[PDB]
Amino acid sequence: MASMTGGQQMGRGSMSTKAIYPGTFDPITNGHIDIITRAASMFDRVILAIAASPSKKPMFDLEERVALATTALQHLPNVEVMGFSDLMANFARAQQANILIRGLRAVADFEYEMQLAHMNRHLMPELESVFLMPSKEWSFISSSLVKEVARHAGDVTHFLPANVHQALMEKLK
Amino acid sequence: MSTKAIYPGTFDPITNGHIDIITRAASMFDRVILAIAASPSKKPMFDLEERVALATTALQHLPNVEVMGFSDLMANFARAQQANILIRGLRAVADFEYEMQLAHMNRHLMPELESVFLMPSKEWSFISSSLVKEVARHAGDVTHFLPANVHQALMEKLK
Known about the structure:
The structure is a homodimer.
Chain A: E1 18-23, H1 30-42, E2 45-51, H2 62-72, E3 79-84, H3 88-94, E4 99-103, H4 107-123, E5 128-132, H5 143-151, H6 162-171
């Protein structure tokens, strides 16, 4: 019925879904892999959006982060890895994404996440934020923690894909 | 291929907040079932038939949404309905803890069911069924928080 309408997003059934999953991914962990795997099972397409210039200087640079993530997620056919240096909402608009994936680990974060969702709603009303809890297995891991453990020779082989594990070991002398 | 989501609750009664959540979910999933719990441990103001009837009317305009009652383990209901997604609205910090616990249990019961969380719109962020009822019980104006059919039914329950 194209001559009459292009159609709207809401109230007319299910639409094509393209999700962004933004983060610093410094480096990507099994926790991140689990989140994106789950999102990729329920949305048509998913972009892992790696922030180029985070406020805290990352251990891996953008090129390394993007390279590691690409390798770790190559087995997922509807997932693509990109870097971005913008607001998550501006990147979403640029990529014609309509879904924003956010991991929800801690109760402390909930308030901040709700506030961010309200801001993103203001910036891009057509972008829906969607929240996934991490699996129980990955619920206590973070990039930061895995790095600090690894720096003092703690075993983190269970928390990272092999390619990331090797790269991390190289960063730490 | 297909996504089929369940959005469970007591919906006693359905509010504009619930309507917002399910509208958003129905835009991203092929099918959505509003699953209304038949026998909640606290006795509801509206019975299942009334809850289901009100919700059906409020959501009739959404073509990929179906309203049903259920009286079984959510995992068993989801399996029966061939659902692979579980929608929960997330309003408060207090709720998040309980919902994370439930999600971990549901992962144990039904690994193939993915729980998904939506924040309510800013407009509906402070409303709940319980609050709207308590306000209405003492003649507060709640016309802004309910669809007309639910508003009329609530007024009747309190007169």
